[PDB]
């Protein structure tokens, strides 16, 4: 009873026909090369070989679209939770400078209902610092949050 719409499938082969410049319903490493250097990136073709790699599934040598589908919804489903992530780092990173400081990390925790000493803060801190200045960036961040 669901999956995709007729509409969503439409845009999908929209983002497909940018890259299959031929028109012959494949993707190839040297199509995927021309849309890269269109992009200001200039790819050597072993690293183009190894982005065709990873998306195709029977091992042809080239992406249909079928499997250009299953790419872009891992994809956009990826980029969903870094989205989530990137939101609750910024409520916590009060004054924008890149770190949660413990006064921070205090100060929302008050707010979601817990009233946390500063030896409690620097505890949570300190099991989550991985560089030793006992703030917390976005890569520390998102490492406590997919698991501990
Ligand atoms: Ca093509
Ligand atoms: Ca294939
Ligand atoms: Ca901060
Ligand atoms: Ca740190």
Do not use: C, W
């Amino acid at each position: 009873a669901e999956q995709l719409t007729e509409e969503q499938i439409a845009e999908f082969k929209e983002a497909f026909a940018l890259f299959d410049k031929d028109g012959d319903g494949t993707i190839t490493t040297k199509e995927l090369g021309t849309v890269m250097r269109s992009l200001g990136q200039n790819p050597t073709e072993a690293e183009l070989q190894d982005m065709i790699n990873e998306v195709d599934a029977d091992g042809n040598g080239t992406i249909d679209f079928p499997e250009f589908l299953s790419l872009m919804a891992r994809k956009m489903k990826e980029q969903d939770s870094e989205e989530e992530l990137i939101e609750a780092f910024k409520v916590f990173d009060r004054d924008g400078n890149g770190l949660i400081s413990a006064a921070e990390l205090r100060h929302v925790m008050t707010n979601l209902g817990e009233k946390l000493t500063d030896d409690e803060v620097d505890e949570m801190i300190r099991e989550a610092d991985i560089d030793g200045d006992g703030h917390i960036n976005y890569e520390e961040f998102v490492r406590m949050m997919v698991s501990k």
